[PDB]
Amino acid sequence: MENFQKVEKIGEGTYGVVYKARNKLTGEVVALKKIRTEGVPSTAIREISLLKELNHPNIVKLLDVIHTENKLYLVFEFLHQDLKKFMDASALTGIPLPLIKSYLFQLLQGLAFCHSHRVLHRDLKPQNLLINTEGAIKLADFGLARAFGVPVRTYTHEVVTLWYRAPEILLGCKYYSTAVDIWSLGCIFAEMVTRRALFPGDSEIDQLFRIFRTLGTPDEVVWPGVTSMPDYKPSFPKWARQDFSKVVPPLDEDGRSLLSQMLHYDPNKRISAKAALAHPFFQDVTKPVPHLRL
Numbered sequence: 652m653e654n655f656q657k658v659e660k661i662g663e664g665t666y667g668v669v670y671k672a673r674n675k676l677t678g679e680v681v682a683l684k685k686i687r688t689e690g691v692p693s694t695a696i697r698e699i700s701l702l703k704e705l706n707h708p709n710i711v712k713l714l715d716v717i718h719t720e721n722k723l724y725l726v727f728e729f730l731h732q733d734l735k736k737f738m739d740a741s742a743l744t745g746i747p748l749p750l751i752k753s754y755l756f757q758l759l760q761g762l763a764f765c766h767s768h769r770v771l772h773r774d775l776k777p778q779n780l781l782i783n784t785e786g787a788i789k790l791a792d793f794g795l796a797r798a799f800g801v802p803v804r805t806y807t808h809e810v811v812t813l814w815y816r817a818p819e820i821l822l823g824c825k826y827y828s829t830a831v832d833i834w835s836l837g838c839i840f841a842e843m844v845t846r847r848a849l850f851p852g853d854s855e856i857d858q859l860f861r862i863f864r865t866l867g868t869p870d871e872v873v874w875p876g877v878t879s880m881p882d883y884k885p886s887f888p889k890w891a892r893q894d895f896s897k898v899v900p901p902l903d904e905d906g907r908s909l910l911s912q913m914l915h916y917d918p919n920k921r922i923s924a925k926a927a928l929a930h931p932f933f934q935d936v937t938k939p940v941p942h943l944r945l
């Protein structure tokens with residue numbers, strides 16, 4: 652905009668580009684997301700204006716939503732680094748378990764809050780989980796298709812990552828439930844632990860089949876109603892479930908039991924954020940500070 656000095660380009664969000672910007676007046680540094688276009692939705696700007704009130708310590712504060720000149724801007728509090736970068740930076744040594752646990756715990760608190768307020772994230776991934784020097788981690792870039800919608804792309808040819816997508820979405824479910832966020836977070840939890848993406852699919856079917864190869868092809872026994880889902884084909888290959896200890900070694904049994912509950916096929920059996928917070932894995936949770944190189 653005119654009231655900002657784009658310092659650098661933070662990246663390519665989910666509907667537009669994101670910049671680190673400095674408010675020419677308050678001097679405050681913010682993250683500015685630009686969005687696309689022959690009018691702009693009205694229902695969107697409202698479901699967006701609802702996010703401004705969604706303030707929580709584990710949710711990136713949305714400062715302002717400015718709609719002008721066919722473009723839509725979202726002004727967010729600026730965080731130092733994203734989890735994707737931090738994980739890559741910690742690839743040789745691995746993120747210490749107490750920090751992995753603290754991050755998982757805080758993200759579940761943030762989700763418990765969003766979900767208790769009927770807001771779903773829908774597109775959780777390391778790139779939109781932001782961390783600071785103080786040990787906090789926050790949910791960002793809520794993709795609420797309940798806002799501008801869930802288009803085919805951001806705004807200009809950019810590959811959408813499917814690695815964290817819940818199976819019910821891949822199977823064509825029309826209505827998402829809060830369970831889709833627990834699934835994505837379970838995938839992120841495993842990735843922090845193992846230092847490798849859990850289900851790195853390169854297409855919707857490959858994503859689906861990678862999940863099936865690891866957790867077993869789902870059926871009516873473990874997931875009632877699955878065979879009646881929109882994109883379910885009786886012709887799907889039938890893989891047996893893999894021993895779970897093979898999935899996230901060397902995570903301890905408390906972590907593995909919580910992960911298995913976050914990855915249940917049936918969205919109704921999948922653990923809620925609220926219950927997850929009570930899991931024994933968090934009995935000794937603490938809040939370590941990360942070693943951040945900014």
Ligand SMILES: Nc1nc(Nc2cccc(F)c2)sc1C(=O)c1ccccc1
Pocket residue numbers: 661663664665669682684711727728729730731732733778779781791792
């Ligand atoms: N608040 C915020 N801070 C950010 N800080 C930051 C991110 C990457 C490198 C860096 F050096 C600083 S990004 C960000 C976002 O709200 C966001 C928007 C769209 C897509 C992903 C994230």
